[PDB]
């Protein structure tokens, strides 16, 4: 039941002799040649520079916190930026960051010591994590140093 149009008739009628007439053997449908995912051109890019490219950061004890919403943010540009030496994402994966949506983002900006950057991971202890800026172990975010 796959080589001849006649054979499909023999197969639908379940007979080896097909009487004269017209027989609706099967159905066809032109298949999607491809997929066209289309969205409106980006209109509300987020200003990461306001927090990242800021000319004056804040002390770690008085760390700045900037709310990000009413906006679209491309975290792939940050992740694929050579300026950042550390991009540690906890609770999420950076490759899927553009895939997900959140109610709001908080950019917590401060300045610490190099030996001290490893204190901005969930569950870490010391003098920055315990005393200056603590991240919960149930952390859904990223750290960019």
């Amino acid at each position: 039941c796959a080589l001849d149009p006649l054979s499909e008739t023999k197969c639908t009628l379940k007979s080896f002799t097909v009487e004269k007439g017209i027989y609706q053997t099967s159905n066809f449908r032109v298949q999607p040649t491809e997929s066209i995912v289309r969205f409106p051109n980006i209109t509300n890019l987020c200003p990461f520079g306001e927090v990242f490219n800021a000319t004056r950061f804040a002390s770690v004890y008085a760390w700045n916190r900037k709310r990000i919403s009413n906006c679209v943010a491309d975290y792939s540009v940050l992740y694929n930026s050579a300026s950042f030496s550390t991009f540690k994402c906890y609770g999420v994966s950076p490759t899927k960051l553009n895939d997900l949506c959140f109610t709001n983002v908080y950019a917590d900006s401060f300045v610490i010591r190099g030996d001290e950057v490893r204190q901005i991971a969930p569950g870490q202890t010391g003098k920055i994590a315990d005393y200056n800026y603590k991240l919960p172990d149930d952390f859904t975010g990223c750290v960019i140093a």
């Binding site: 499909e8 449908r29 032109v30 066209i36 289309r38």
Partner: protein, 88 residues
């Protein structure tokens, strides 16, 4: 954007299979979908360039076979119902 091809379009959250053709439907400046009495998506506004496209379901239908008696002859003609001549 590709027109005149059966595609799996995903205009915003609205997904569907069909062929996209430029049209003259005058969507109001706020309208995105188009619909008919059957409550089926008929037209869509292209999100990133403000244009109106109709979603014609891709050529589909029954495949009837016209055959004389098998004892008479083995020759066969094929009738693709309600479809233009596309693939032979």
């Amino acid at each position: 954007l590709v027109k005149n091809k059966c595609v799996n379009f995903n205009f915003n959250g609205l997904t569907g299979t069909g062929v996209l053709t430029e049209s003259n439907k005058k969507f109001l400046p706020f309208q995105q979908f188009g619909r008919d009495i059957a409550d089926t998506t008929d037209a869509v506004r292209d999100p990133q360039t403000l244009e109106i496209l109709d979603i014609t379901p891709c050529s589909f239908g029954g495949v009837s076979v016209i055959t004389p008696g098998t004892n008479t002859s083995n020759q066969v003609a094929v009738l693709y119902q309600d479809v233009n001549c596309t693939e032979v």
